[PDB]
């Protein structure tokens, strides 16, 4: 069979799909028309940004159907002859905003660095959290939690070893990673996650914790890391970039071998990202910690 990809939609594409298809179909299902059931553009923007979080538009269709069903009830009940929905009266048709923030972290403390992931449900973002388990003053240790798979646990071990080796030469006096007990976690612990693409993210989190310096606030990075630090290509970067645009980042880090797959994206998607391509992790270090 022929593999044909049907990628996800950005907020602009979702708005354009909704205005032209979702509202007209839902109005026809409810038996209404544009003359007495008007759904303004700003309402759809709020719905996309706060009442839905997905690559598709399946939840947005349900939200639009709910809004128009409530409008039909109001019209038939005689409460109002014509109904228009506005941001200040949207809560009369739908409950409180489900998602009140676009990202889990506004500003990232030193222990956490932002990353991107690709799953069967489309692109998404994850944050690799890292913090001490014992006070500082024997070998160190690394504990990993978050329903990580075997491949991702091995990637975390490789990342820890590479971060140790990197600090052994970039700053010999900083014995942090070789003598301190460290616990690493990935939020949403109920969701099983796997894949070696989180390697460089884990290295960046460990280095940021060891140096006590936060990463760039709007920087997301992906890419498998080797024991020597060479970055290896990863798949599913279309959905990763769509999610990164959804998450509101401005800088992204990609493996150099994936340059051929990033530019396949449309112009209006990649225009807002300060895209960086890396061959070895030292470039990621120079990007995440510019000074």
């Amino acid at each position: 069979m022929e593999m044909i990809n049907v990628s996800g939609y950005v907020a602009q594409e979702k708005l354009a799909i909704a205005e032209r298809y979702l509202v007209p179909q839902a109005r026809a299902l409810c038996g209404l028309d544009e003359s007495k059931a008007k759904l303004s553009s700003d309402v759809l923007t709020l719905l996309i940004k706060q009442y839905c979080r997905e690559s598709g538009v399946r939840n947005l269709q349900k939200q639009v159907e709910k809004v128009l069903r409530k409008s039909a009830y109001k019209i038939v009940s005689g409460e109002a002859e014509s109904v228009e929905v506005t941001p200040e009266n949207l809560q009369d048709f739908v409950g409180k905003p489900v998602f009140t923030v676009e990202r889990m972290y506004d500003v990232t403390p030193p222990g956490v660095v932002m990353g991107l992931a690709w799953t069967a449900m489309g692109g998404s973002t994850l944050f690799v959290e890292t913090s001490l388990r014992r006070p500082q003053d024997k070998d160190g240790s690394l504990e990993v939690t978050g329903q990580l798979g075997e491949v991702m646990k091995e990637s975390a071990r490789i990342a820890y070893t590479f971060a140790r080796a990197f600090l052994m030469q970039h700053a010999p006096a900083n014995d942090y990673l070789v003598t301190s007990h460290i616990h690493l976690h990935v939020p949403e612990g109920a969701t099983p996650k796997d894949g070696p693409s989180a390697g460089c993210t884990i290295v960046t989190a460990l280095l940021s914790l060891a140096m006590g310096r936060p990463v760039r606030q709007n920087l997301a990075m992906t890419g498998e890391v080797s024991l020597t630090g060479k970055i290896l290509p990863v798949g599913g970067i279309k959905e990763k970039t769509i999610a990164a645009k959804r998450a509101g980042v401005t800088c992204i880090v990609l493996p150099a071998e994936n340059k051929k797959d990033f530019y396949d994206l449309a112009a209006f998607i990649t225009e807002g990202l300060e895209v960086h391509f890396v061959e070895h992790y030292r470039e990621i270090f120079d990007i995440a910690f510019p000074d």
Binding site: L29, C30, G31, L32, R69, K70, A72, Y73, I75, V76, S77
Partner: protein, 179 residues
């Protein structure tokens, strides 16, 4: 079977809201959803479209909600069990040449109800090829001409308002969930 006999349905929201308030306490969300469905049907001019599926824990008495809806809409009520069903012949009846043949439960509903537009509750649909025959009943593209093995003549079920209940939203039939 009542050829062409119709009970005049009532789609007034005030009557339906009053009826749901007399015989049902609390559960304002379900009442709101039913009122919205009735308003949508009134605007559409007919009650056809998406089949209402009341799902929830066992022993909640979802049959009472369907009874109240039937009372409000002036539609005669009927009870249609499909839990554990494996034979299509329950839906469609046995062939007339069989010994002791009996038509499907739909024809029994038509005979007992004595109107062409009853409210039929397909309860416990999640414990239901038996699935394939039920698509033929709930699909308006073919609902207008229902053919059974007993009478062997088409019967028009266009105005029948099908309602169903289930114990879990993860119903074992996939194609039925879309409708």
């Amino acid at each position: 079977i009542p050829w062409g006999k119709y009970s005049n349905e009532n789609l007034d929201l005030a009557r339906a809201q009053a009826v749901l308030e007399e015989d049902h306490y609390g559960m304002e969300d379900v009442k709101k959803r039913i009122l919205e469905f009735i308003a949508v049907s009134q605007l559409r001019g007919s009650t056809q479209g998406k089949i209402l599926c009341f799902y929830g824990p066992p022993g909640v008495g979802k049959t009472s909600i369907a009874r109240s809806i039937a009372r409000a809409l002036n539609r005669e009520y009927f009870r249609f069990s499909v839990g554990g069903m494996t034979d299509v012949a329950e839906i469609k009846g046995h062939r007339r040449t069989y010994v002791g043949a009996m038509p499907g439960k739909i024809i029994q509903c038509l005979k007992k109800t004595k109107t062409e537009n009853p409210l039929i509750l397909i309860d416990e649909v999640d414990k239901i090829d038996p699935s394939s025959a039920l698509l033929e009943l709930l699909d308006p593209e073919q609902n207008a001409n229902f053919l059974d093995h007993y009478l062997d003549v088409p019967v028009d079920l266009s105005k029948v308002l099908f309602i169903c209940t289930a114990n879990v939203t993860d119903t074992i039939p996939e194609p039925l969930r879309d409708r």
